[PDB]
């Protein structure tokens, strides 16, 4: 049997990043705001997590633990900590160097294994190597006890430099460091659990066993939901220096650390069984690809140093953990099967990725069609590329259900699948061209019909001339070799030209109430400004670049197969990655465009408060409209302006509270659009104030 | 084997009301306010509970269900609904008769089965009758869809009465009621679950299985915590008419409904097996002793009708529901064992209620001792009573570990146990006497000395005269008949006298920084205010009556044994109840006194908000200090006044965030005590405002 239950990995990830996704769409849709997520955070970080730790360490048997694994992971984490710390000490701004050295190693060493790592390890190693579930509750607290103190010492040194007074105490900063380390629920709950394990004999009392199980089982889902709740509105556009340091930190989290852990395990472990040693090394690798634990974000926000870099890094690393961990575990278990089960495995992962991406794509197309935003040219081409992605994702499903079974319709399904995939590649090219045209000249008369017929016909011509030449080889399971070298040649030439088209573009990249059209010209100006938006050129650029990433990966795959024509144990990674991306592009498209915020007594009391102690305040200054030609309401305020004023005054805690309060004010007959065209939102629109 | 695993009942309750307790002490200690509890409530009521329903019905097999059980429970609920509704229709205020008829029946028919009933049924009927776990998810949504429509129709009728118009049509009212019930997640989620059960073949897809398990396992742990969070402050002192209607409603929830369900089940069940029918009737009884689901509270707060009666009724019903479930499940299976295993069972439940009470009682005693409040007179007397209550629990614990084992020390352990128990009875008597004396002029100091010597020596004299007369019958397991009939008489005489004493008592019911030493009087008055209270004679009275309830129960038990001397299958209920109360009084004392509220950039930003837009509004309004003899600070405001002003203005939504804002603003060096003796709390203390 395989060292791990690989077939159970994808649902578990689908659970984890499923629950997180729920939380995100709960936070963005104002179902659970930022203030209201504090209660969930306190519950999961004060009651659920300490009960899980206590229950899972009291029963733990300290006499049957492979300490070599813990030593190896601790050595690897310490090495990454030291390397990052010394590198920051050498090259960084001298003003905040200590800060950049007191948080960056913590970002690159800790892991989100309690909430986002434990479900995956449980799914992988529960019916094969259950003892692997103990190390999650040992490595994380120990590494939190032997690395966090050094980082916090550095942060307290930076705070000392913030004051730079006559205080020269060297023990005070260290004491505060270990005090802030010891004031963490994880550390002292670990200590209490160990003490009670020593007191008892690994027999949790029956009186408290049910309480502990009930309060600990409700951690994983709740913790993931809270993580999703805090993971909305954090990531922001960064300076190029911030971009490159984020790249380096994320790479040091999911590239340096896993390799270091696997090397140390294959260096220290003395296990007689080769299979056990290989599985242990695989576990060491898969333990380091875990995302950055959100504890680094709260540490940064407590010290108030690099809050944006640390929070955005944790947010991005949470995304990047999923595909990396999936491909890592699959590639790690790949050299354990014959090439024929290898082909079945790659087909099955393609089918799973295809079903889930198809659901996401159908959803995103639902937003596109019911939002009527596809009329604009960029969104028209995005919808066209998205329906092409839906066609390829469904064609893969039908192909796996018809591979080598019905040769009669195999020609038809192959034609549909690869015509749609070539359409996706060429449509990435056409998207690049469309943003090129938008940047070059505005208000052009070029039809979209020519672009559409090209993007759906050149793939059709390619597949037709591919079918005409050669013969059908209805024996290979994979679709890429249904025809042979000819098919790979066509798939390489169209893929090549697609990336040249993409790269060429990329490189160069009075009144009181409602007023009449003359007296409400500012509303028309705001409507024109809004029409100037709703394009999201940066969003399209991001989609195109992330698509070009997989386009280049598949180009490298086809060139390697054509020229070398030798597997060499490296080509398996290439085929797996190309099969992953070809039908996982739906996830990317859903992530960028499939999700967006665009698409009585209590309210009376709130309106009374606002009109009692806040109507006549400095908001009167912030509410004003300039003369719209000859006449104006002179009582119109921007939604963002009122939100900012409410935040600064203190009636709201974040933007969500401000927008909900404004929604209540609107429902209370006080706030309304100057022309009633729209409804309260945190965007630049003038709103009249009535009375 | 027994029809239910009764030995696992106590831990499960201890889990459930344990988790709730955590939530309460989380809410009371301001760890999670109500606004922050809104997020947890939304999570549990929108993502966890719907996932649990969907997962538990997609796999549900409608082909094999005992429909007679559901028919019986629905008939019983409908009968209770009809009886209560017609009763409040006949006798109630005509102005709000419809309100009292549309909320009371849904208060006395629904149950907290999803969160507070499922764990108990799982603990009782998982390894014996697992099919009993389906009916929790079947009866509750059905009763929601067949009873709450009528209730909501009545509430909409009351709303029509509130705003009378010439629209006799009932179509709008019934439509609004059906829309209100249909907007509940518990309704359309079970509809979708049934639809997907029909679509599939009770095989939830592996892609969503892990997601559903992860998002549904975090409901039982989290719903109880949210219930505890929302249980803080919802109980309010009620008028005597409200008291009697609450008595009637709680009785109709845990006396009428379970009896009706059991009768209807033993009316419609055609089960051939007598054991299965008896177990089903026991399940029907144990399903109606469940507490009122908090959905009735949110319905009442949505309609804004009897919010105080419904909320307080749910709060009280949940607490009453625990001992009633314990005694009901024990008594129901009580005649399933021989009298000697009967004695072992009552001893074991005594040992369980003994250990838990000792843990909470040591906690309460520690609170009293480190509070230094035992120097007070009522508090000294109740501290002595509490020490006796701890000694009796410890003696019972030792007795169970020494019963019929070491006859040498059995005399000593028995003497300790029953001397402590007689001390508790006589100390309830002396507490009644002390509160009667406190109700008087109280110019005479209470004789602490002779009262304590009496309360701790008269039990010693009683146990000595009991030991002197008679012989040692060291064969009976129960401690009430270790000696014989003489012990019964000795217990009955002191118990009688204690209630006579208690019944008699019951029926007897300038400057800016610092004020000058010679120019400061009102600060001395507000200091006197504190020790004018801090006696909580109402709390002591409530504890006294709660104790006399069990004293009367035990008196009835001993009188029945003395006079009738016949078991009759009813005296077993008496011995179980007396053994439950003898060592359960620690729970009452802990609930009464063991828990109470008595025992930098963000703060700068809040202080900036205050020093930008809030002092001009409040200083001119909320601060006013009379001349302290000759001079005063003229800037002292009561904490309650400031909290009320903050609530009304809108800086806080309730008292919790109001006092949190006050604590922050104190830490900002603006608000402080007039003489700096005390911190910021929501009481009647004067606070200066500095600059
Ligand atoms: C049979 C069971 C009956 C249950 C009945 C109720 C029992 C409740 C026990 C716990 C209640 C605790 C409520 C305290 C309210 C405040 C919570 C609290 O202190 O914060 C949560 C803390 C950690 O916080 P932090 O992040 O370090 O905060 C800084 C802090 N302010 C400071 O001091 O800077 O962390 C904690 O306080 C964690 C508390 C949660 C406890 C969960 C795990 C332990 C369960 C209890 C163990 C029983 C098993 C014992 C075995 C046998 C023993 C005889
Ligand atoms: C060595 C441990 C072995 C035992 C095993 C269990 C392990 C427990 C986990 C370890 C933590 C122990 C918790 C004890 C309390 C420590 C207090 C603490 O850590 O401070 C944190 C808390 C609250 O946070 P805050 O922001 O400081 O709040 C203060 C104030 N309220 C404010 O507004 O800023 O500060 C407070 O203010 C807290 C006061 C609340 C106290 C209420 C406790 C009730 C316990 C009742 C349980 C008794 C047993 C019950 C039996 C069964 C009953 C159903
Ligand atoms: C492996 C799967 C990966 C999945 C990835 C993520 C997918 C997420 C799907 C669900 C998340 C939806 C987020 C919605 C955000 C808004 C919340 C929302 O609508 O309010 C909560 C609602 C119901 O509340 P209400 O009391 O009626 O509120 C009144 C409401 N405003 C109204 O319309 O008046 O209640 C809800 O919104 C309930 C939604 C929670 C869903 C949990 C149970 C269903 C899980 C999904 C089922 C899939 C199984 C299908 C099997 C295979 C089928 C092909
Ligand atoms: C928010 C509003 C949602 C409205 C949605 C529209 C109505 C509901 C959908 C239409 C009715 C149901 C159609 C499918 C039922 C029949 C097909 C079926 O189940 O076959 C089983 C088959 C079983 O597959 P199989 O039989 O091929 O299994 C073999 C698998 N291998 C090969 C790997 C061994 O497929 C499924 O399991 C169905 C797809 C499940 C996808 C689960 C993950 C997707 C993530 C999103 C889930 C839903 C989120 C909710 C919001 C999104 C909108 C949906
Ligand atoms: C919040 C701060 C709390 C600090 C507490 C003070 C420090 C911790 C306690 C002192 C050290 C440990 C002493 C006990 C260890 C040895 C005895 C032992 O447990 O033996 C097992 C024995 C086992 O009993 P047994 O072996 O007789 O079991 C047989 C049972 N029958 C007969 C029914 C079959 O006793 C216990 O289980 C002890 C009670 C455990 C808890 C039970 C529920 C109590 C409710 C509260 C739980 C705790 C909440 C946390 C806060 C409250 C304060 C505690
Ligand atoms: C990724 C794929 C492959 C790419 C290959 C090519 C990329 C380069 C590879 C080597 C990089 C080593 C580090 C070199 C850093 C170069 C400087 C830099 O990126 O910017 C430093 C940044 C400048 O900021 P500045 O614009 O001055 O800001 C002013 C306003 N505050 O100032 C800072 O913010 C300073 C903080 C920098 C912290 C760097 C930590 C790096 C840790 C991981 C590196 C690898 C470690 C392991 C190596 C292998 C094992 C031995
Ligand atoms: C060379 C060795 C390869 C080893 C492979 C495995 C290890 C890879 C290690 C991770 C590499 C670092 C990735 C970190 C990307 C950081 C990007 C970033 O900071 O950009 C933020 C951006 C969001 O931008 P924002 O402005 O918020 O969006 C506005 C919306 N219109 O958001 C983004 O731009 C998100 C970018 C991340 C998207 C996923 C990238 C995954 C990378 C690995 C995939 C698998 C391996 C690919 C190998 C290709 C081979 C040809
Ligand atoms: C087996 C037969 C019984 C079956 C189930 C019960 C049905 C019949 C009894 C129904 C009614 C029981 C509860 C009555 C609650 C009435 C409300 C009440 O007492 O609340 C007021 C009290 C104090 O409120 P507070 O605001 O603090 O007042 C300040 C004083 N100035 O607030 C409180 O302290 C809350 C109320 C405490 C309730 C104590 C326990 C219940 C009363 C005993 C009778 C029912 C249980 C019998 C068996 C117990 C053991 C199994
Ligand atoms: C419990 C232990 C034993 C107790 C023995 C003594 C009582 C025996 C039972 C008596 C029942 C009488 C029911 C009618 C209520 C009597 C009057 C009352 O308590 O107050 C009704 C209250 C009026 O309040 P008022 O003082 O006027 O308020 C002033 C400000 N508006 O107005 C209201 O708020 C009306 C609310 C009526 C709700 C009645 C619910 C009854 C449900 C259970 C009854 C039995 C049902 C099952 C019986 C067996 C099956 C048929
Ligand atoms: C193996 C790989 C190819 C797929 C398996 C993991 C998926 C289930 C993951 C990968 C990418 C994830 C998505 C990446 C990006 C986001 C945006 C994220 O929200 C934000 O970061 C934006 C919040 C805001 O609007 O401020 C919410 C989750 C979501 C949809 C993720 C949902 C889960 C996804 C699809
Ligand atoms: C193997 C393939 C399938 C890659 C798997 C990962 C992607 C599906 C993820 C990883 C990074 C994600 C992106 C990271 C950042 C953002 C920005 C985010 O928008 C913001 O600027 C956040 C704030 C806001 O939306 O208000 C929207 C999601 C998006 C495009 C994410 C879309 C989904 C991405 C590409
Ligand atoms: C069957 C018997 C032996 C035990 C039944 C279960 C116990 C574990 C229950 C019985 C009474 C319960 C207590 C009754 C009263 C309260 C007060 C309650 O808080 C409030 O209602 C007031 C909150 C506020 O001050 O605002 C918090 C739970 C608690 C301690 C309860 C915790 C759980 C207890 C001890
Ligand atoms: C089988 C034996 C152990 C009896 C089990 C029942 C008692 C232990 C429970 C049942 C109801 C409980 C009461 C329910 C509600 C309250 C009000 C609660 O708070 C108040 O006094 C109201 C104001 C507030 O604190 O919010 C204090 C605990 C108390 C008296 C509880 C004390 C413990 C009681 C009596």
From Swiss-Prot, chains A, B:
Residues 68-71, 122-134, 202-210, 262-282, 335-348, 403-405, 469-487, 564-573 are lumenal. Cholesterol binds at residues 10, 24, 233-235, 539. GO terms for biological process: cellular response to amino acid starvation; cellular response to cholesterol; cognition; intracellular signal transduction; negative regulation of BMP signaling pathway; positive regulation of TORC1 signaling; transmembrane transport. Residues 347-599 are annotated as: GPCR. One of its GO terms (cellular component) is lysosomal membrane. The chain crosses the membrane at residues 6-26, 47-67, 72-92, 101-121, 135-155, 181-201, 211-231, 241-261, 283-303, 314-334, 349-369, 382-402, 406-426, 448-468, 488-508, 543-563, 574-594. Changing residue 560 to R: Abolishes the effect of cholestrol depletion in mTORC1 activity. It comes from the Eukaryota. This is Lysosomal cholesterol signaling protein. InterPro entries: DEP_dom (IPR000591), GPR155_DEP (IPR037368), Mem_transp_PIN-like (IPR004776), mTOR-Rac_regulators (IPR051832), WH-like_DNA-bd_sf (IPR036388), WH_DNA-bd_sf (IPR036390). Keywords: Glycoprotein, Lipid-binding, Lysosome, Membrane, Transmembrane, Transmembrane helix. It is found in: Lysosome membrane. Its main location: membrane. Residues 613-691 form the DEP domain. CDD domains: DEP_GPR155. The keyword Transport does not apply. Residues 1-337 are annotated as: PIN-like transporter. Glycans are attached at residues 276, 348. Cholesterol binds at the interface between the PIN-like transporter region and the GPCR domain; these two regions likely coordinate to sense cholesterol and regulate mTORC1 activation. Cholesterol-binding protein that acts as a regulator of mTORC1 signaling pathway. Acts as a sensor of cholesterol to signal cholesterol sufficiency to mTORC1: in presence of cholesterol, binds cholesterol, leading to disruption of the interaction between the GATOR1 and KICSTOR complexes and promotion of mTORC1 signaling. Upon cholesterol starvation, GPR155/LYCHOS is unable to perturb the association between GATOR1 and KICSTOR, leading to mTORC1 signaling inhibition. Binds indole-3-acetic acid and may play a role in tryptophan metabolism.
